[PDB]
Write an enzyme that holds these catalytic residues in place. Sequence first.
Site, PDB file in Angstrom:
ATOM      1  N   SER A  81       0.766  -1.245   0.000  1.00  0.00           N
ATOM      2  CA  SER A  81       0.000   0.000   0.000  1.00  0.00           C
ATOM      3  C   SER A  81       0.802   1.304   0.000  1.00  0.00           C
ATOM      4  O   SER A  81       0.240   2.367  -0.267  1.00  0.00           O
ATOM      5  CB  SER A  81      -1.020   0.015   1.143  1.00  0.00           C
ATOM      6  OG  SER A  81      -2.106  -0.859   0.875  1.00  0.00           O
TER       7      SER A  81
ATOM      8  N   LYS B 149       0.448   3.839  -2.772  1.00  0.00           N
ATOM      9  CA  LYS B 149      -0.696   4.741  -2.813  1.00  0.00           C
ATOM     10  C   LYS B 149      -0.313   6.209  -2.646  1.00  0.00           C
ATOM     11  O   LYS B 149      -1.018   7.099  -3.121  1.00  0.00           O
ATOM     12  CB  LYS B 149      -1.757   4.304  -1.798  1.00  0.00           C
ATOM     13  CG  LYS B 149      -2.446   3.014  -2.219  1.00  0.00           C
ATOM     14  CD  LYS B 149      -3.275   2.379  -1.111  1.00  0.00           C
ATOM     15  CE  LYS B 149      -3.764   1.001  -1.544  1.00  0.00           C
ATOM     16  NZ  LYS B 149      -4.425   0.243  -0.451  1.00  0.00           N
TER      17      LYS B 149
ATOM     18  N   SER C 124      -6.170   3.550   3.306  1.00  0.00           N
ATOM     19  CA  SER C 124      -5.529   2.481   2.536  1.00  0.00           C
ATOM     20  C   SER C 124      -6.545   1.672   1.713  1.00  0.00           C
ATOM     21  O   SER C 124      -6.337   0.490   1.433  1.00  0.00           O
ATOM     22  CB  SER C 124      -4.708   1.567   3.458  1.00  0.00           C
ATOM     23  OG  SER C 124      -3.860   0.706   2.715  1.00  0.00           O
TER      24      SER C 124
ATOM     25  N   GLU D 290      -4.768  -3.885  -7.296  1.00  0.00           N
ATOM     26  CA  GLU D 290      -5.131  -4.411  -5.985  1.00  0.00           C
ATOM     27  C   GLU D 290      -6.150  -5.526  -6.205  1.00  0.00           C
ATOM     28  O   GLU D 290      -7.031  -5.406  -7.056  1.00  0.00           O
ATOM     29  CB  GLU D 290      -5.749  -3.311  -5.122  1.00  0.00           C
ATOM     30  CG  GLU D 290      -4.778  -2.216  -4.708  1.00  0.00           C
ATOM     31  CD  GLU D 290      -3.841  -2.628  -3.577  1.00  0.00           C
ATOM     32  OE1 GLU D 290      -4.008  -3.728  -2.999  1.00  0.00           O
ATOM     33  OE2 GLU D 290      -2.939  -1.831  -3.250  1.00  0.00           O
TER      34      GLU D 290
ATOM     35  N   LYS E 273       2.469   6.308   5.571  1.00  0.00           N
ATOM     36  CA  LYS E 273       1.655   5.381   4.796  1.00  0.00           C
ATOM     37  C   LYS E 273       2.219   3.982   5.029  1.00  0.00           C
ATOM     38  O   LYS E 273       3.389   3.707   4.754  1.00  0.00           O
ATOM     39  CB  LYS E 273       1.671   5.702   3.300  1.00  0.00           C
ATOM     40  CG  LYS E 273       0.715   4.823   2.482  1.00  0.00           C
ATOM     41  CD  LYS E 273      -0.736   5.064   2.886  1.00  0.00           C
ATOM     42  CE  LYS E 273      -1.692   4.030   2.281  1.00  0.00           C
ATOM     43  NZ  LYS E 273      -1.578   2.694   2.924  1.00  0.00           N
TER      44      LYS E 273
ATOM     45  N   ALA F 119       0.862  -3.615   3.898  1.00  0.00           N
ATOM     46  CA  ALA F 119       0.713  -4.971   4.396  1.00  0.00           C
ATOM     47  C   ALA F 119       0.414  -5.858   3.196  1.00  0.00           C
ATOM     48  O   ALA F 119      -0.281  -5.441   2.271  1.00  0.00           O
ATOM     49  CB  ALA F 119      -0.417  -5.043   5.415  1.00  0.00           C
TER      50      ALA F 119
END
Length: 263
Positions: free
Chosen positions: A45, A48, A105, A141, A209, A212
């Site tokens: 993540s 992002k 997230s 994703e 940020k 995982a």
Amino acid sequence: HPETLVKVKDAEDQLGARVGYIELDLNSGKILESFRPEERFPMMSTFKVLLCGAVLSRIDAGQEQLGRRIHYSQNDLVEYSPVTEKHLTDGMTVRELCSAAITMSDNTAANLLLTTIGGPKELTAFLHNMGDHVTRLDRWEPELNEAIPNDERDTTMPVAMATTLRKLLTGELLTLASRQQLIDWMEADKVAGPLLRSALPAGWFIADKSGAGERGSRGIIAALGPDGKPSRIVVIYTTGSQATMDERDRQIAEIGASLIKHW
């Protein structure tokens, strides 16, 4: 400080996995400390922040607007989409999508934003055109979180991510309003509590940020410093561990504690 390297090594021992570390001076861009700075690690993540970095670049160019409403259906929803699942009928603006992607997230918000800029290939082209020649995004994703061993897809190097983050936040790539907008989102981050924020003293600034993924993948990128002003960039990645999330978060938090102690 070398003592912090001791903790990073200790972390690798505890987690039974690799831990990439880099402490960068936000001002001069000088590398203060590093561990496996040029080894690849799954971004997860943390990308992002880069995604919205590219979205804001388009906002500055006039090719995109913060208030433009984007509509999506249930077909677009992927796992872990806490904000996007609540606005199927209402839709969401570009500003809300980036807030949801960075602050919460939100996975679907990342995918929706990814399509507006041209997908993974364009994000990589954007990073390349700004000096980052190693950080690459390939999938969407939630596939980009696979973290298959030796897979170079959707990875970065602690040193590349660190310098790229510095350029976005303090460089001349984005307008003052956009750079400030990016950090506001990162400061409002509500999911990285168990990490560096837990080891942060009162009054300190923190814009981060977390990340995982599968196979024990965990990481975080941050801009922090005392007196409510950021003065250093910290990037921590780890993958391959069979340890639980709490054990992983505890080690990263310990690295952050050592980072603070020998500030």
